[PDB]
Amino acid sequence: NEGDAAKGEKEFNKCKACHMIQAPDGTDIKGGKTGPNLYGVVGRKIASEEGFKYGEGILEVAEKNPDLTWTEANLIEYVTDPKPLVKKMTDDKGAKTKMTFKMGKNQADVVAFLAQDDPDAXXXXXXXXXXXXX
C-alpha cells in the first residue's frame, strides 16, 4: 500500500493500450486513444478532460456531483472495479462504463503514480466535502 509508483508505472502497462498520459504538450508513456489522458486525473474532476466520448454515466454523476475531483482514493476504488463506483453513485443501476478493465491486486501502488503525474493538489486545496476537495 506503500503505494510505490516505480511499481505503479510498471503496471500502467496494464491501462496504456486504452489510455494516453501525455501533457498539455508531450507524452509521458504512450497509450491507446480509447481512454482519456490519464495524466492529471489526480486533482482533476470526474470526466472533465475535453473532446472524448465519455460514457453517459460518469457524465451524469459528474453532474449530480459538480464536485468530484478524482482524489486518488477514488482512483483506487474506480479502477478496482468501476461500475460498482460509477453506478452506486448515480444510484442508477445499469452503470455501463466504457471502461471494463477490473484491477484487483495493486491499487494504491497505482493511484500513487497517477497522483504524481497530475502535480497539482496545490499543496492542499479548494474545497473539502468528502470524495472531493480539489
Give me 63's grid cell: 453532474
**99: annotated binding-site residue?**
yes
Instruction: Give me the 35-74 binding string for ligand HEM, x by CB under 6 A, dash otherwise.
Output: xx----x----xx-x----xx-xx-----------x----
Q: Min. distance of Cβ 124 from ligand HEM in angstroms? A: 21
Closest CA to 34 of 82, 99, 85: 99
Whether 35 and 19 have beta carbons less than 8 Å apart is answered as yes
1-9, 21-29, 93-101, 116-124 -> range binding ligand HEM (CB under 6 A): 93-101
What DSSP character marks residue 22?
Answer: -
Q: How many CB atoms lie within 10 A of CB 77?
A: 17
**H or E segment at 37?**
strand 35-37
Q: Is 78 in the site for ligand HEM (CB under 6 A)?
A: yes
Residues that bind ligand HEM (CB under 6 A): 14-15, 17-19, 34-36, 41, 46-47, 49, 54-55, 57-58, 70, 75, 78-79, 97-99, 101, 103, 110
